[PDB]
C-alpha cells in the first residue's frame, strides 16, 4: 500500500523536522515521492505544509529499515 506508506513517511518527516528544529509546521499532503532501494529504502518526498498558516512546499529525504523499528529524517528544506 505504497501511497499509504508514503503519507505516513511524509507526516513523519514533518514531525521529525518540528521536533528537531523546534518548529510547528502543519502537514497538509504529499505531492511527489520517489522510493529508492539502497541499504534499506530512501524516500525523496515533496510535501505541502503550513508555516504559520501559509502553505509552503518542502522537500524531505527519509531513510527506512523495514526489518526493524527504524526511520530517519536526513534532510528537510523549503522548495
Numbering used by the authors: 32 to 110
Sentences from the paper on this structure:
In the present study, we describe a new artificial binding protein scaffold that we have named Adhiron. This scaffold is based on a consensus sequence of plant-derived phytocystatins, which are small (ca. 100 aa) protein inhibitors of cysteine proteases.
The Adhiron scaffold was derived from the phytocystatin consensus protein by initial N-terminal truncation to a 92 amino acid sequence which we refer to as the full-length Adhiron scaffold, or Adhiron92. We have determined the crystal structure of the full-length Adhiron92 scaffold by X-ray crystallography. Amino acids 1–10 and 90–92 are not visible in the electron density maps presumably as they are disordered. The thermal stability of the Adhiron92 and Adhiron81 scaffolds was tested by DSC and both gave identical profiles with a melting temperature of 101°C.
